[PDB]
Design a protein around this ligand. Structure first.
Ligand SMILES: CCCCCCCCCCCCCCCCCC(=O)OC[C@H](COP(=O)([O-])OCC(O)COP(=O)([O-])OC[C@@H](COC(=O)CCCCCCCCCCCCCCCCC)OC(=O)CCCCCCCCCCCCCCCCC)OC(=O)CCCCCCCCCCCCCCCCC
Ligand SMILES: CCCCCCCCCCCCCCCCCC(=O)OC[C@H](COP(=O)([O-])OCC(O)COP(=O)([O-])OC[C@@H](COC(=O)CCCCCCCCCCCCCCCCC)OC(=O)CCCCCCCCCCCCCCCCC)OC(=O)CCCCCCCCCCCCCCCCC
Ligand SMILES: CCCCCCCCCCCCCCCCCC(=O)OC[C@H](COP(=O)([O-])OCC(O)COP(=O)([O-])OC[C@@H](COC(=O)CCCCCCCCCCCCCCCCC)OC(=O)CCCCCCCCCCCCCCCCC)OC(=O)CCCCCCCCCCCCCCCCC
Ligand SMILES: CCCCC/C=C/C/C=C/C/C=C\C/C=C\CCCC(=O)O[C@H](COC(=O)CCCCCCCCCCCCCCCCC)COP(=O)(O)O[C@@H]1[C@H](O)[C@H](O)[C@@H](O)[C@H](O)[C@H]1O
Ligand SMILES: CCCCC/C=C/C/C=C/C/C=C\C/C=C\CCCC(=O)O[C@H](COC(=O)CCCCCCCCCCCCCCCCC)COP(=O)(O)O[C@@H]1[C@H](O)[C@H](O)[C@@H](O)[C@H](O)[C@H]1O
Ligand SMILES: CCCCC/C=C/C/C=C/C/C=C\C/C=C\CCCC(=O)O[C@H](COC(=O)CCCCCCCCCCCCCCCCC)COP(=O)(O)O[C@@H]1[C@H](O)[C@H](O)[C@@H](O)[C@H](O)[C@H]1O
Ligand SMILES: CCCCC/C=C/C/C=C\CCCCCCCC(=O)O[C@H](COC(=O)CCCCCCCCCCCCCCC)COP(=O)([O-])OCC[N+](C)(C)C
Ligand SMILES: CCCCCCCCCCCCCCCCCC(=O)OC[C@H](COP(=O)(O)OCCN)OC(=O)CCCCCCCCCCCCCCCCC
Ligand SMILES: CCCCCCCCCCCCCCCCCC(=O)OC[C@H](COP(=O)(O)OCCN)OC(=O)CCCCCCCCCCCCCCCCC
Lengths: 60, 89, 86, 64, 76, 128, 164, 469, 184, 86
């Protein structure tokens, strides 16, 4: 258990880096699909200001 | 939640419009409980919440005890009559 | 005396189970690329093995102990797309 | 008054004993010790009620 | 011949009768009650003389109960 | 497609193959006397369902509560360290409650089939 | 012995100061007054006395007969149980400050001061983790309210006693 | 205390012979009385309406629940007296009223289920308690298994109660699927405004309410009441009704519900009118129970219902016990015993009861006029409190329907007294055997409560103001 | 693969519909019990598919291994009469069956929504046209599965529920004995 | 109570929104309680993703109504065997 505790921060840092990268990427993709239309792609569906990685993608 | 809902509705209709035998009524009860548990467990997975699964476990234990008591009641009813009519109740 | 004809079927059973198990061990090791099997692996181990696949080029359970990751490790991250549980 | 409450509750007990004698098709004074026992028991209940009510009034007054 | 002498008439004679004539029940009961009684009466003795209880294992990341220090190193 | 799923599919296939071989290779010549139920070489009359003893019912009915009792201990043995001393006390209380029911079953002689006919023990008395 | 959750401090359950919001079983018994033991004895006597008096009023078999010793013994055991329950509840209510508790308040002050002099935790050391201590406290706190239904006691040394 | 009694009773009864039954019941009777008088002081905990969550928020204890628990204890004491004490010592009464070996255990387990329903703070607690009470009640209905009617009734109970238990479970799981919660405590005014829970909460309410037999699902329970042994009927038509209604009163999940309003109206109409052509005593009393259930159903439409509900349920329980006891007492004076489970069946068998036992008929008159609502009997004050509550909240049409139902049900209440005060040709001269002292005293105490309880009305309100405000 | 393996859930649903119909239409009630066993295997399949294989095994252990066994035991010992499904007996139900089917199914799909408008309430039911994104983190260092967590909450947070369940099982013993055994 | 406990004994998927809403309800009173409407909204959003599904419906409707090409770093689906290949 202590071995896993000492590894937790680096693994979570790598995963957080990926979470940021892919969330910003999806925002850019969606705003490019919605260019030319009257819809805000940056507006969160939540009311708090906090970062919210997407759930729920369009099936690929 | 589709499979649980369909199972529950069809089991209820089978119980209500049963005009054939009493065992069908027992079975429809058991399967209505199964459908309810299925709906609950899917919601438990989608919330990642142990409360639904805890309730489902309790439902299983209570269905066992209810089955035992219902069949004891049926046997006590049989003891005086020696047969179950297709209206046996 | 010890009746050996009465032991012959027990010997057949013992030999069959022994040889089948030895063959199974060899097949498992060969499937693993030269190491013993992993057993009783939890969610942590599962994620670690997926990360290993990302680092070693998809070579199963191959290990690399170099301090710095290759470039492709930045862009071969996988998320899973799960169908709606209806 | 506490004394009046005890008399009234004991009278309730006396009425209970009388009605139980009558329902058993017995004379009013059939087992007269039962009147004493019934009166004492119902007086005890009346006393408990009186004390609880007095405490309730005390509490209502102390929040002022 | 042999018959139940009644527990409440005499405790030790009834216990002897049970051990002789109902061993399955008698020793099932003895084994069953041995446990909790031993727990209550023996675990403190084990703690005092044999060894104390072990230190708890971590269950999650142990978060410091403090403010963030300013630190230095491995910077961009 | 791991070995588990392949093995589980394979077993019924082999059963069905043996059945098919038997159907394909054995002769099949039913006739009335062969089709009779075998009861020691004779024939018996069709009868109303036998009257059965209550212990027969009771074993099967009481299986379910005892089975549920036993199976309810699975969460405990899978969580024993996590709940250690508090849960140990709780599981002891749960077991003791179920043992009271076992005691009831044992003392009522609920699964004993009593031989209805017993030797007569009355004295022989003569009015002289 | 550090609490994981915030508790109320010196909350008023009644007209008297709070001593202990979830007193330990050992303390509830140890703080019992002679009047509580009189209650235990009264119930122990009352149940078999009640069974005999009921026999006298309306005999089970027409002719009066003293109840056998098996029923007197069971009545004595159950009467002790009711008496102990009532005595436990009376002592507990003194710990909540619902009834008069001056003697108990003084005795608790002295006991806590002595333990502090000795360096011990005021409510003892537990063999449970703090999370299990919290769950135990939330199972036992105010459980005496359910005395009609079920018995539940505080057997855990936890820190959640509602004091400063 | 209750759990302890159940454990001890299972052991003791297991080691006891069938002839000890009544003795055992007597023991438990006195035990319950002791718990009522030595543990009563715990009421102090609830001074100023202090509420306690208990058992990791699974249970809720307040003054309302404490009172309901005391009432259920009192009812259990009264009903267990009817099994522990012989009315008469002759052979016929031994045959009529003999307690089964396991009946007392089933009663105590059912009481546990009821008390757990009352105190339920979480839906898992509610469902476990509901199934405990339901299973116990099926077994209580079946335990007289020499009777054809009782065994058939037990089967009908099992199946209808199972369907309604399924409805309750489905309601709870839909609530969970919407809120990820199992407690009503998570409901706030903001949540109620934001979400539509009405369909879920009314489904739960209906699942609970059909289990005590409101209209239009009344006939099955009335059949069960008719076809059980009379000493079983006294228990099974009261305890579930109290437990379920008390839970719904304390939960307040149907305030100003249109559906509950319509079903309450239908229940009052069906209960009053459908009692009119009844000729069997137990069917008449079952329709009376239906009408009084409708009265109490009205209180599920408003907040601050506690005083009127507690008053009504208390006086109704007292009157229900009294009328069943009077019917039991009248068995000795009838010409024709219909069978060993229901010795008296038809109202007409009470004809001329006044010439055999005048004071029994006086007791009947008091109880009947209390059911009708004549002051200053307790029934009048129960109905008055209910009217105050509903008119304070604007339920005008329902108040008129309540008045009409009261008038209509008075006819079948007066039927009993009417036949009971007519003339009969062969009247009683003397009899050597007296009815039991214990049961006669209990019946008389109930009559005296119904008659003179109003004297304590203002004192009761004063205490209520400090324990429920 | 993909085509079959994507619609495994839908296949379980279709099989469940068929199995329920077969339960109700069976000539022999023993055959009805067997179709009930089939429905329970299908339910175990669904539970495995949504990630709850432990509940699959528990359902197989308890509902087939115990409850269905008791069902068969009882129908074997007891004399049951049954009539067959027929137009003369059952076509009279078809109108009510159809109305009840539509009303109950629609309402059972609508009870889940939070939209004010009824048509939107029903429409949300068929509104999962999207995939859930499964993501990783590293905060769980223990090997805690569903069974372990159930044990943890049932024995500590909800211990009272376990003890009450013990009473319910006590009832499941005492009651059957009370009404199936004749004392003395 | 088991509220807030996930399938693995930690915090469930929507615990954070629920805890912030509970902080809100604890600080306000019945008259002020409506001030907590956004928090509760967020909680329900996490539970059911209704607004997210609506927004995806809008984006997908506009996507399927376009013949012009898309020039942005895309998403690529791979077999589980091809995790880490190349
Ligand atoms: C282990 C079982 C043997 C235990 C007792 C041996 C008794 C004995 O050897 O004397 C026979 C003797 C008969 O007297 P005798 O016939 O006049 O003279 C014996 C012959 O001259 C001499 O007769 P023998 O030639 O049979 O004895 C020599 C023997 C061994 O001589 C010994 O006694 C050595 C000490 C014991 C070791 C046994 C080695 C062989 C074990 C058998 C498995 C082979 C692998 O060596 C062998 O020949 C082995 C048999 C050849 C191979 C068998 C084929 C293997 C097939 C695959 C089997 C795999 C599954 C197993 O009987 C006794 O003395 C009393 C025997 C009662 C035994 C009581 C139970 C013993 C403990 C429980 C054992 C449970 C099994
Ligand atoms: C394991 C974990 C430990 C926890 C559980 C402890 C169980 C240990 C029980 C030992 C039993 C050993 C034995 O040989 O019993 C013989 C007995 C058979 O005797 P038998 O003569 O052959 O039966 C046939 C006769 O014809 C039948 O003759 P019978 O009709 O006269 O029946 C004989 C009697 C036979 O039963 C017994 O003799 C065993 C009873 C021992 C337990 C009694 C505990 C009483 C403690 C309170 C003290 C009360 C008096 C205090 C006086 C005031 C002090 C100044 O049967 C009963 O009455 C069953 C007792 C029912 C419960 C009554 C106890 C009331 C609960 C007391 C609660 C205490 C609250 C304390 C407050 C907290 C304080 C910190 O076997 C059993 O009892 C079966 C086991 C069931 C035990 C329950
Ligand atoms: C109660 C009356 C009987 C008293 C027996 C002994 C009392 C005693 O002095 O124990 C001292 C004992 C040692 O004291 P200590 O050495 O100074 O340690 C100081 C702290 O306790 C240090 O505690 P800690 O925080 O450091 O450690 C955690 C705590 C862990 O403690 C817990 O987790 C207990 C929490 C569970 C709540 C229990 C409430 C009772 C529930 C009754 C059933 C309700 C069901 C509802 C159904 C609906 O302690 C343990 O580790 C003990 C582990 C288990 C010990 C062995 C368990 C034996 C059980 C069978 C006892 C049979 C006694 C003989 C027959 C009588 O304290 C204990 O913790 C032992 C557990 C207490 C027994 C629990 C169950 C008692 C029997 C059930 C009650 C039945 C009601 C009868 C009365 C009803 C009204 C008349
Ligand atoms: C080395 C051998 C492997 C070791 C063990 C396996 C078994 C080996 C034994 C192999 C063959 C011997 C058994 C063959 C045997 O008795 O059928 C004989 C005929 O005989 C042949 O002429 C029919 C031609 C027989 C076909 C032989 C196929 C051999 C491989 C089977 C796979 C009797 O059937 P039969 O005439 O009543 O013909 C048929 C047949 O039994 C049923 O399938 C029909 O449905 C039914 O209508 C019935 O009329
Ligand atoms: C065991 C058998 C197991 C079977 C299971 C399968 C069944 C699944 C679902 C069934 C569940 C059980 C069904 C029970 C009967 C449902 C009846 C029911 O709940 O009362 C209604 C439903 O209010 C709907 O808005 C709901 C309207 C109904 C939905 C519309 C119907 C759709 C069908 C399409 C054709 C509750 O409003 P309510 O009385 O409070 O009425 C009002 C009103 O709602 C508000 O304006 C007021 O503010 C409020 O105070 C109140 O006065
Ligand atoms: C506030 C509301 C709460 C409670 C109010 C309810 C009741 C009042 C309070 C307490 C009730 C307790 C009363 C005890 C005093 C009552 C009392 O005289 O003894 C009994 C009845 O005694 C209970 O049957 C005792 C039964 C006790 C249970 C009564 C509960 C109703 C009646 O005497 P009794 O002369 O006929 O009794 C005689 C005599 O005892 C025998 O020796 C004779 O052989 C026999 O002929 C018999 O007639
Ligand atoms: C020495 C121990 C004896 C105690 C045993 C009690 C057993 C209860 C058994 C049956 C219930 C009968 C009615 C209970 C009386 C309510 C008391 C109360 O005032 O009710 C209030 C709440 O008012 C309500 O909601 C409305 C109640 C509606 C009552 C309707 C009937 C009125 C007619 C009764 C006339 C009184 C007869 C007196 C005879 C002299 C709760 O009071 P509380 O919770 O603070 O407890 C009291 C303190 N106690 C525990 C020591 C007793
Ligand atoms: C040595 C053993 C034998 C002697 C035992 C000695 C015991 C000493 C104490 C005995 C009882 C004295 C205290 C209780 C008074 C009861 C007196 C009594 O017997 O009943 C009173 C009265 C009927 O009395 P009685 O004149 O005998 O008429 C019987 C038939 N006509 O009936 C009534 O008045 C009923 C009134 C009930 C309601 C009154 C409420 C108003 C307050
Ligand atoms: C413990 C839980 C596990 C076992 C549970 C089973 C309990 C069964 C007990 C039982 O049923 O008692 C009945 C039996 C009475 O005898 P019988 O005539 O056969 O009754 C049959 C009815 N016709 O009873 C008996 O005769 C046998 C039971 C006797 C119980 C006394 C045993 C006392 C144990 C003494 C040893 C304790 C070990 C050391 C303890 C140190 C601290 C004290």
């Amino acid at each position: 258990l202590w071995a896993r505790i000492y590894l937790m921060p680096l693994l979570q840092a790598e995963e957080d880096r990926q979470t940021v990268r892919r969330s910003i990427a999806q925002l850019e993709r969606e705003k490019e699909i919605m260019k030319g239309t009257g819809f805000d792609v940056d507006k969160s569906v939540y009311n708090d200001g906090k970062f919210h990685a997407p759930a729920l993608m369009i099936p690929p | 939640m589709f499979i649980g809902t369909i199972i529950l509705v069809l089991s209820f209709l089978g119980f209500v419009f049963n005009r054939r035998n009493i065992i069908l009524a027992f079975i429809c009860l058991e399967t209505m409980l199964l459908g309810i548990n299925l709906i609950l467990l899917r919601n438990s997975v989608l919330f990642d919440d142990i409360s639904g699964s805890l309730f489902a476990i309790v439902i299983i234990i209570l269905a066992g005890v209810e089955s035992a008591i219902g069949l004891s009641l049926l046997v006590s009813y049989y003891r005086l009559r020696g047969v179950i009519n297709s209206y046996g109740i | 005396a010890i009746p050996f004809e009465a032991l012959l079927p027990y010997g057949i059973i013992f030999g069959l189970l022994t040889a089948g198990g030895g063959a199974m061990q060899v097949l498992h090791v060969y499937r693993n690329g030269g190491v013993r099997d992993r057993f009783a692996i939890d969610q942590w181990d599962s994620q670690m093995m997926e990360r290993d696949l990302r680092l070693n080029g998809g070579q199963g359970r191959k290990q690399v102990d170099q301090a710095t990751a290759p470039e492709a490790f930045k862009h071969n991250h996988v998320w899973k797309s799960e169908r709606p549980l209806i | 008054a506490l004394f009046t409450s005890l008399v009234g509750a004991s009278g309730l007990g006396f009425a209970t004993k009388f009605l139980s004698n009558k329902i058993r098709l017995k004379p009013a004074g059939y087992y007269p010790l039962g009147y004493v026992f019934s009166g004492v028991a119902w007086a005890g209940l009346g006393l408990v009620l009186h004390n609880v009510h007095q405490h309730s009034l005390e509490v209502l007054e102390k929040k002022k | 011949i042999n018959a139940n002498p009644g527990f409440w008439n005499g405790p030790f004679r009834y216990l002897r009768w049970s051990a002789h004539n109902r061993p399955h029940l008698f020793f099932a009961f003895a084994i069953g009650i041995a446990g909790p009684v031993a727990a209550l009466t023996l675990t403190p003795l084990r703690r005092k003389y044999l060894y104390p209880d072990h230190s708890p294992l971590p269950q999650s990341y142990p978060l410091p109960q403090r403010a963030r220090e300013q630190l230095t190193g491995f910077d961009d | 497609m791991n070995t588990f799923i392949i093995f589980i599919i394979l077993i019924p296939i082999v059963g069905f193959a043996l059945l098919a071989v038997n159907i394909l290779l054995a002769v099949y010549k039913p006739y009335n006397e062969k089709l009779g139920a075998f009861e020691c070489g004779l024939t018996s009359f069709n009868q109303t369902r036998l009257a059965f003893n209550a212990a027969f019912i009771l074993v099967a009915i009481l299986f379910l509560p005892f089975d549920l009792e036993i199976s309810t201990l699975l969460p405990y043995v899978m969580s024993i360290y996590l709940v250690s001393n508090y849960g140990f006390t709780i599981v002891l209380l749960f077991l003791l409650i179920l043992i009271i029911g076992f005691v009831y079953e044992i003392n009522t002689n609920a699964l004993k089939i009593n031989k209805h006919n017993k030797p007569n023990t009355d004295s022989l008395i003569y009015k002289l | 012995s550090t609490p994981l959750v915030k508790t109320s401090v010196n909350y008023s359950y009644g007209d008297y100061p709070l001593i202990d919001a979830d007193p330990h079983f050992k303390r509830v018994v140890g703080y019992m007054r002679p009047s509580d033991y009189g209650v235990i004895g009264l119930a122990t006597a009352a149940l078999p006395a009640g069974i005999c008096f009921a026999e006298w009023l309306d005999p089970v078999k027409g002719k009066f007969a003293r109840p056998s010793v098996k029923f007197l013994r069971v009545a004595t055991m159950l009467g002790f149980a009711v008496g102990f329950g009532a005595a436990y509840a009376r002592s507990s209510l003194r710990f909540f400050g619902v009834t008069e508790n001056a003697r108990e308040y003084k005795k608790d002050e002295a006991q806590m001061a002595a333990r502090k002099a000795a360096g011990l935790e005021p409510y003892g050391t537990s063999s449970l983790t703090p999370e299990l201590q919290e769950i135990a406290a939330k199972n036992s706190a105010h459980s005496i309210a359910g005395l009609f239904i079920f018995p539940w006691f505080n057997f855990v040394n936890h820190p959640y006693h509602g004091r400063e | 205390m209750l759990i302890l009694a159940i454990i001890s009773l299972i052991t003791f009864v297991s080691m006891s012979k069938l002839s000890d039954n009544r003795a055992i019941i007597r023991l438990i009777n006195i035990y319950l009385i002791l718990v009522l008088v030595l543990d009563s002081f715990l009421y102090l905990l609830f001074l100023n309406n202090q509420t306690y969550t208990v058992m990791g928020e699974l249970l809720i204890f307040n003054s309302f629940t404490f009172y309901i628990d005391m009432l259920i204890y009192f009812i259990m004491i009264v009903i267990s007296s009817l099994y522990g004490y012989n009315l008469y010592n002759n052979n016929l009464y031994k045959t009529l009223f003999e307690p089964k070996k396991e009946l007392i255990i089933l009663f105590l387990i059912n009481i546990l289920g009821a008390l757990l329903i009352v105190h339920s703070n979480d839906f898992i607690t509610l469902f476990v308690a509901i199934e405990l009470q339901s299973y116990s009640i099926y077994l209580i209905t079946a335990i007289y298994n020499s009777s054809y009617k009782a065994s058939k009734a037990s089967m009908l109970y099992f199946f209808m109660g199972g369907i309604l238990s399924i409805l309750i479970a489905y309601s709870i799981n839909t609530y969970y699927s919407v809120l990820n919660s199992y407690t009503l405590h998570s409901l706030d005014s903001l949540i109620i405004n934001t979400l539509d829970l009405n369909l879920i909460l009314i489904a739960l309410s209906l699942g609970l309410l059909f289990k005590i037999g409101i209209a239009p699902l009344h006939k099955w329970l009335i059949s069960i009441y008719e076809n059980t042994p009379i000493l079983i009927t006294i228990y099974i038509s009261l305890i579930p009704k109290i437990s379920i209604l008390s839970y719904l009163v304390l939960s307040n999940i149907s305030i100003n519900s249109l559906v509950i309003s319509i079903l309450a109206i239908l229940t009052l109409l069906v209960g009053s009118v459908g009692g009119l052509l009844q000729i069997k005593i137990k069917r008449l009393l079952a329709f009376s129970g239906l009408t009084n259930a409708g009265y109490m159903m009205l209180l599920l439409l408003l907040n601050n219902n506690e005083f009127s509900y507690l008053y009504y349920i208390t006086q109704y329980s007292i009157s229900h016990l009294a009328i069943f006891m009077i019917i039991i007492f009248s068995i000795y004076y009838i010409n024709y015993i219909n069978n060993q489970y229901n010795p008296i069946i038809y109202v007409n068998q009470l004809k001329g009861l006044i010439h055999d036992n005048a004071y029994l008929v006086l007791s009947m008159a008091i109880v009947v006029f209390s059911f009708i609502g004549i002051p200053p009997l307790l029934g009048f004050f129960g109905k008055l409190n209910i009217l105050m509550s509903i008119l304070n909240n604007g339920y005008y049409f329902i108040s008129i329907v309540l008045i009409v139902a009261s008038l209509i049900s008075a006819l079948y209440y007066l039927y009993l007294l009417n036949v009971s005060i007519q003339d009969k040709n062969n009247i009683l001269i003397n009899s050597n055997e007296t009815v039991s002292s214990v049961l006669s005293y209990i019946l008389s105490s109930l009559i005296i409560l119904i008659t003179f309880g109003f004297i304590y009305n203002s004192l009761i309100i004063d205490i209520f103001n400090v324990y429920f405000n | 693969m993909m085509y079959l393996t994507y619609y495994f859930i839908e296949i379980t649903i279709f099989l469940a519909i068929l199995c329920t119909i077969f339960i109700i239409s069976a000539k022999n009630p023993m055959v009805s019990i067997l179709y009930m066993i089939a429905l329970f295997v299908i339910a175990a399949m669904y539970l495995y598919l949504i990630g709850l294989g432990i509940f699959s095994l528990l359902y197989i252990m308890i509902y087939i291994g115990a409850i269905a066994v008791l069902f068969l035991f009882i129908i074997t010992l007891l004399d049951i009469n049954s009539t067959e499904l027929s137009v003369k007996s059952n076509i009279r139900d078809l109108p009510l069956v159809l109305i009840s089917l539509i009303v109950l199914t629609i309402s059972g799909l609508m009870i889940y929504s939070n939209d004010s408008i009824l048509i939107n309430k029903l429409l949300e039911a068929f509104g999962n046209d999207y995939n859930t994104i499964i993501t990783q983190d590293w905060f769980n260092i223990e090997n805690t599965t569903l069974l372990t967590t159930i044990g943890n909450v049932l024995l500590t947070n909800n211990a009272f529920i376990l003890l009450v369940l013990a009473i319910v099982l006590l009832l499941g013993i005492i009651g059957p004995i009370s009404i199936t055994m004749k004392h003395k | 109570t088991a509220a807030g406990i996930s399938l693995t004994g930690g915090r469930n998927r929507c615990f954070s929104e629920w805890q912030s809403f509970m902080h809100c309800t604890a600080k306000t009173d019945a008259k002020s309680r409506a001030q907590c409407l956004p928090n509760f909204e967020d909680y329900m959003e996490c539970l059911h993703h209704t607004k997210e599904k609506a927004r995806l419906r809008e984006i997908e409707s506009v996507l399927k109504q376009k013949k012009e090409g898309l020039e942005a770093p895309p998403v690529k689906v791979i077999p589980v065997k091809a995790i880490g290949l190349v």
